[PDB]
Symmetry: C3
Subunit: 266 residues, 3 copies
């Protein structure tokens, strides 16, 4: 049944998603899932040997290619990473269920670990375009929640200290920040960015927190990595050019992809 239909149980569709993915991939269960956001598009190429590719629109609940990858750890053991193909934003109007469907499907496949990445604007002048920042916490400014009902979930540690420790083994220099989510799709005015800051955020973007609350609700351990696309409006006196931003964004691709693939082995 259609995820859009309020009578529909969202987890029942995630269930059917998971069961399709297992049949189409020959992988009974996965161990971790990655949501590659703006800028990480090739961040999974060094994850490992692709085991299966599933036309994403073919999976229950969805509507480009979801990948199943054998991650090989140093001791030789293997994990199975589910790389979600698409991504649906809150701004698309498709409902919060559609925004978090990837996450709940990740869950149903048994992937206890979730890696959420995104592109965003930075409020700390110390982190320029290209800088990856670990999420230490978040501020959901969407006035939305992906949970329906008396689902009183606790968010005291949405972003697992365990996982950031493992990220800091791969690169002890990665800074940490509080990520704030705006509904988007438009960008923030300088007065809005000052606001984000006053409220305590170090980063601003238009995704991830709904996904994160959803995942914690499913009992997942969540790693959150932002790739600062460029300083937020009004932060730097000398704003980068749009071409400069896109340029600083491509430059990061190899580093960023090296990062994920390494963290994923642990």
């Amino acid at each position: 049944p259609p995820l859009d239909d309020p009578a529909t149980d969202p987890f029942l569709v995630a269930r059917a998603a998971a069961d399709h993915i297992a049949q189409a991939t020959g992988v009974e269960g996965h161990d971790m899932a990655l949501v590659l956001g703006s800028g990480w598009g090739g961040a999974a190429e060094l994850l490992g040997e692709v085991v299966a590719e599933v036309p994403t629109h073919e999976i229950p609940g969805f509507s480009s290619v979801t990948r199943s990858i054998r991650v090989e750890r140093a001791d030789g053991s293997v994990r199975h990473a589910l790389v979600l193909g698409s991504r649906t934003h809150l701004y698309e109007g498709k409902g919060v269920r559609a925004v978090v469907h990837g996450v709940r499907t990740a869950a149903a496949t048994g992937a206890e670990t979730l890696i959420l990445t995104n592109g965003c604007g930075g409020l700390n002048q110390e982190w320029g375009a290209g800088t990856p920042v670990l999420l230490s916490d978040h501020i959901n400014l969407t006035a939305r929640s992906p949970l329906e009902g008396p689902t009183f979930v606790d968010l005291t540690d949405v972003y697992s200290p365990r996982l950031r420790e493992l990220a800091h083994r791969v690169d002890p220099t990665l800074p940490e920040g509080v990520y704030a989510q705006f509904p988007g799709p438009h960008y923030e005015t300088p007065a809005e960015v000052r606001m984000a800051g006053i409220l305590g955020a170090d980063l601003v973007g238009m995704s991830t927190t709904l996904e994160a609350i959803a995942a914690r609700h499913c009992g997942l351990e969540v790693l959150g990595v932002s790739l600062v696309t460029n300083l937020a409006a009004g932060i730097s006196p000398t704003p980068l050019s749009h071409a400069e931003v896109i340029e600083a964004g491509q430059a990061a691709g190899p580093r960023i992809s090296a990062l994920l693939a390494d963290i994923a082995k642990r």
Copy 2:
């Protein structure tokens, strides 16, 4: 007509609601109404003589028991209190009309006083779990409103000085606070809690302000009382276990039940 349809006038449903109530109870008009939040389930047991109980889902506009209670005052005269059953939340996804329908039903019965109570997280460390707090003002962070048109209504004193005066005669030690309504149902993150602080809140919860605005627009005097369920996330260095919370919550039962009962007689 069903409240869910934009065509329906929510007030006409309220009217049907109050007419059902006067018929079923034999009480032609109530004088005051009480909404019992989390932790107040038994706060109306010393209120007075229960004259009638109406299964809530039987009153037009709803869908668990609504009560008419006689309040015997000092001077020997009576007052009838309507104790609204349910309490539909914004997060239930049934619409803002469903949220404030009880308040409009109460207004329709002729109540001129509304007491709203709720359970919330506290940000003042002085107010441990079990602490009742009068609302001196609120901050509605739901980006939603109960009013549907160029209905420009004044909120300069949503929480009546008169009623807080009376409550202080009953118990001059009730502190007062500014309450913030988040849409929920998830709880706030340590960063969002600090944020509520930064914005000027002393308390965070998932209800009440929509109801209060609805009420003032209907001309009622509002008294808001919160019951700190437990310090908000990240507030206390030392979290209280669930046993401590549920425990501090039950110990407060006798006090708030006596509080309302006294307040109702005035």
Copy 3:
């Protein structure tokens, strides 16, 4: 097709609107457009010669009178100002598309400059009721966006410095401030007002920013002018009576329409 039909292209409907206007008015294109807000009702009477009046409920996508005005310039040339009739608020529940249809219809007629006016409450005590204020930036607190897709648009200078400079050649005494948009229609509680102050706003109201973001997306140069209806709740020690507000409101009429006429010539 109807605008609230998600499959409908909001821009096709703007186009259809621009075409109706062109034939109904005889003017092939407009150069600028004005949105008359609360208190600006007669602010376009001195603009110039009314070349045509089109009942609004008659232009595609709408549902009082939309005006086509010839503006005579210093060098003798002329410009055409499309003065939008109506004005649909976010609160009416019609959808964000109907809120910014006016703007999109203006752009489609070829207008390049847009003057957004509104009445609002003020947080600065030096700007009492009747004071016109220019917007230097805004804070959109509605959790909504007029944009429906990966439409990533830069909002670093929503309110054109160019125009604000012209605004100041006309009247060098106009102060500037940051505008906060609440979804409304209920007004703000004293704490919500302090909140807006802490967040960086000098003015609070129920419109403008979604339109502005919409204009900026269409490539329009935006000039935003508020008229302080009166001080925000809890700001002034001695609040004005509603009689004093409406009065201060009308006494500003001639200055306000002189202002727009002079600005319209440039």
